[PDB]
Write a protein that binds this ligand. Structure first.
Ligand SMILES: [Ca+2]
Length: 634
């Protein structure tokens, strides 16, 4: 039997794990689905706290993988995959096989433009516009004996809060919110069911808010978040390493993750399979492969009749990349996917991803936003002097700008944690300078108060300038800059940051270079101090948390764009029409126990103070404890 480390960091993990699994704390639904957070009143990527995301499912796998590592008990990890497959990977009634089977890989979808403001939607279908070929479909169909897609949809209404599942049900409902481009903030969306049978909304359900066509038929649509599915692979690898040491068989769960990783190759592709670089032209297969983890792939089709479509995404954010997942799927025996080309494709993505991070690394060391094969999301010409990466144009804030998608320091920790774990696992020398420079910038920006045993980390980032066009090696990007504009006690992110610094330090442990030894000490001590202070100062009943201020809750009254003459209804009867607000189409928010507090604060012009326990945040903190406790058995 394996010898499990006995130190305080292992015990901190176990105490956090116990809090997360304590029924008193309410992290989980009746089905065993992790909510976005314990609390209900919050508007972030999901716009209600008891929605959840595919991110939460993969964090749940990761948490359980670490517990299995430390205890030899894999029942929790199996449970996490079981609920994932049951409730967030669309099944037969969600993506009817008859529609999926009528897919045409030579005509994957119909082009529509993205627009710089929600008021420019619905976007007209252009049946004459170029769309390239899907080179994955036939291989996947031959491999798995079906045309259905095995990937997670990104957003779930866990207890049917919107009521799209009917008035007397709390079964989970697949939903979408964001649809209307770069300037549609979380406050400006219209929630819709993924399965639009036109029971709710207007004449055509919600369909003609987003898509312009002469007729509308009932249909489904699911949208993947590639970083969540990649994390599922990352978690399952960690579980399998432990399983081999404990002597436990979880091969069928390994098989689930490699299948998910197989379909995740759709995240490599331009939205309409346009050639990368010469994006006005239809691709003929892999010439439309960007080979990064894009912002989404999506798929849909008919309910009342049999037809289907698929798209990738032309947009790529450094924050979504995962070299650890790509290395797992391409360079380990256990996780080679069943499609003949999958391992090779993933090996190519691994290479491209590591270059992408380097290309985006600022002069200070923070990683800049990303790049797109489609300027304005409508393949507009790039301005002269646009800096590029394999033909894709630099974008300081990929995909969304309210707020800027690279304003939040969280993306730095989340994504660079993966590079660090990858570097530890593979010792790929191409990752070293990247990590050296990033770690120096991150550690230089942690503010410790040693007397209070508290700290702050960067909260909000400001970007200027642009990288040198990628020619094969890092330049230092002396004209690309990041400034930290605000710091905060962002504890979930601090957990991720500690995780990253721990793997980075551990990877450096074998160096005999004097400068590496100094970097080792700095990274390891910074990581440890973060964990010690989290433990000493920020514990409460439900986990580890601190008050935060939301000054934008004034946007509960944010106007929502609805086309003139368009009318509809939410399931609870809320009227959807011009003049509607975020709140007026979500009137159940006023039934929330914390609502009086919110409107009180707004009424006398105060910020709103909240204490949140987000599932990913508590998980990141727990896993950070377990990570330090297992890498440094001191
Ligand atoms: Ca439920």
């Amino acid at each position: 039997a394996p010898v499990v480390p006995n130190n305080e960091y292992v015990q901190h993990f176990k105490d956090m794990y116990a809090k997360i699994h304590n029924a008193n704390n309410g992290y989980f639904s009746d089905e065993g689905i992790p909510y976005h957070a314990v609390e209900t009143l919050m508007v972030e990527a999901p716009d209600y706290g008891h929605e959840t995301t595919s991110e939460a499912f993969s964090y749940y796998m990761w948490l359980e993988a670490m517990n299995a590592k430390l205890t030899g008990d894999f029942s929790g990890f199996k449970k996490a995959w079981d609920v994932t497959e049951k409730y967030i990977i669309p099944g037969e009634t969600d993506q009817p096989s008859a529609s999926m089977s009528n897919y045409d890989p030579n005509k994957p979808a119909t082009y529509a433009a993205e627009h710089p403001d929600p008021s420019m939607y619905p976007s007209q279908l252009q049946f004459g516009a170029a769309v390239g070929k899907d080179p994955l479909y036939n291989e996947l169909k031959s491999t798995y004996g079906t045309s259905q897609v095995y990937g997670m949809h990104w957003l779930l209404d866990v207890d049917n809060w919107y009521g799209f599942g009917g008035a007397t049900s709390t079964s989970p409902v697949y939903i979408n919110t964001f649809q209307r481009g770069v300037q549609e903030s979380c406050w400006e969306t219209v929630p819709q069911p993924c399965k639009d049978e036109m029971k709710y909304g207007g004449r055509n359900g919600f369909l003609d808010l987003f898509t312009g066509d002469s007729q509308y038929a009932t249909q489904f649509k699911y949208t993947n978040a590639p970083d969540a599915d990649a994390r599922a692979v990352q978690a399952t690898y960690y579980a399998q390493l432990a399983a081999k040491e404990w002597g436990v068989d979880i091969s069928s769960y390994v098989a689930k993750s490699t299948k998910m990783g197989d379909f995740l190759r759709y995240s490599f592709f331009d939205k309409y399979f346009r050639k990368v670089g010469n994006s006005t032209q239809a691709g003929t297969g892999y010439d439309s492969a960007q080979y990064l983890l894009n912002w989404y792939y999506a798929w849909g089709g008919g309910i009342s009749s049999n037809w289907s479509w698929r798209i990738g995404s032309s947009h790529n954010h450094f924050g979504y990349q995962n070299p650890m997942a790509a290395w797992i799927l391409s360079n380990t025996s256990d996780f080679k996917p069943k499609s003949p080309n999958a391992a090779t494709d993933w090996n190519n993505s691994l290479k491209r991803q590591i270059e992408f991070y380097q290309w985006l690394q600022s002069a200070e060391g923070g990683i800049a936003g990303g790049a797109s094969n489609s300027n304005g999301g409508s393949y507009q010409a790039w301005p002269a002097g646009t800096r590029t990466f394999y033909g894709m144009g630099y974008t300081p804030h990929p995909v969304y700008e309210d707020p800027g998608s690279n304003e939040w320091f969280g993306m730095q920790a989340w994504s660079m944690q993966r590079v660090a774990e990858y570097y530890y696992s593979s010792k790929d020398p191409a990752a070293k300078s990247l990590l050296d420079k990033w770690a120096k910038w991150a550690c230089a920006n942690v503010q410790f108060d040693d007397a209070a045993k508290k700290f702050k980390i960067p909260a909000k980032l400001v970007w200027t300038g642009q990288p040198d066009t990628w020619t094969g090696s890092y330049t230092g990007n002396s004209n690309l800059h990041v400034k930290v504009e605000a710091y905060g006690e962002d504890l979930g992110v601090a957990g991720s940051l500690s995780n990253a610094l721990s793997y980075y330090a551990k990877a450096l442990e074998s160096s005999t270079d004097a400068a590496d030894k100094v970097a080792y000490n700095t990274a390891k001590e910074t990581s440890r101090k973060i964990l010690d202070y989290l433990w000493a100062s920020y514990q409460d009943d439900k986990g580890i948390a601190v008050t935060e201020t939301r000054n934008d809750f004034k946007r509960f009254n944010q106007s929502v764009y609805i086309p003139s003459g368009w009318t509809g209804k939410m399931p609870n009867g809320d009227v959807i029409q011009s003049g509607a607000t975020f709140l007026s189409i979500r009137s159940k928010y006023k039934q929330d126990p914390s609502w009086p507090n919110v409107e009180a604060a707004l009424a006398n012009g105060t910020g709103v103070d909240m204490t949140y326990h987000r599932f990913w945040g508590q998980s990141d903190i727990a896993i950070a404890f377990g990570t330090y406790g297992t890498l440094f058995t001191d």
